[PDB]
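Now for a concrete sample entry.
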Amino acid sequence: TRFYDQLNHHIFELERKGGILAIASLIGVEGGNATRIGRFANYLRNLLPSNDPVVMEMASKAIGRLAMAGDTFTAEYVEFEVKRALEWLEGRRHAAVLVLRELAISVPTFFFQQVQPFFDNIFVAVWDPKQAIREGAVAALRACLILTTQRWYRHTFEEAEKGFIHGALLILNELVRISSMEGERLREEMEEISLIQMTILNLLPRLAAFRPTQYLQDTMNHVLSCERTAAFQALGLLSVAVRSEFKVYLPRVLDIIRAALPPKVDATVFTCISMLARIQQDIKELLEPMLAVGLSPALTAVLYDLSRQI
C-alpha cells in the first residue's frame, strides 16, 4: 500500500495543483486512518499555520474530510484549528474562513454552544484597515450560525444590527440567512434558470423573512448603487421568497432590466426576467429583445426554462 503513503507524503512535499487535487480523492475516502490520522492529521496540525497555498487548495476539502472523522484526535483538531483560525481570521490569511466553514459544518455538537467565541474573535479580526478581512471574516460566522438552527438571534442579532455599514451589513446577512434557511433552497430554485455589494444583493430574500420592511428599503437603496450593473436577481428572488413589498421596487429596476437587451448585465438580466414569473405580462413584453439577442447558449437555456415557467 505504498501508493497511498507516497501520495500522502507528496501532499505537503508537493501541474502540482492538478496532481495534489487528484490525490485529494484518496484522503478521507480510502479510510486509511493509520496514515490519515497518524500522519496527515498531525501534518495539518503542524503546517496549517504556515501551509503553502498550493497545498492549502487540497486542505480546503481535506480539512472537512478530517473533521468529519469524529475521532478523539479529530475533536482536538477541530477545537485547535477553529480557535486558531478564529484568532487569525490579519490581512493575508484568506483561507481561514474556509477552514472554519469546513471544520464547524456538520458537527453542531461543538458549535451551537460555541457561537460566542466565533463572534468575539471575528469582531476582533474584522476591524482591519485593509477591509479584506472586514469582508472575509464576518462571512465565516455561517459555520456556527447555520448550525445553531440545527444543533441567540435574539441578543447577538442586536449586536449584529448596531453593535458591529460593513460589519453590521455582513453579519446581518449571515444571520438573516439562518432566520430562514429556506432561502438557500430558493437560491437554487432561482439560480437554476466588494463583498458589501454582493451582501446587499443577497440580503433581500433573507431580509424579507425576518421583519416583513425598512431593512429591505435601505438594502434596495444600496442595490441601486451596487453604474447600474448590479445583479438585480435579488428583486426577482423575492418573487419566491416572502413578497415583502417587493412590488414597491419593480417600477425602478425593471427599467434596468428592460433597457439591457439585445446586447449591449446581459447574462444576468436573462435570469432576472425569468425570476419575475415565480408577473407574466412584463415577461411577455421582455421576451422580444431576448429573442432579438440571437441564439447564444445562455439564451437557449433561459428560454427553455421560460417555456417551462410560462
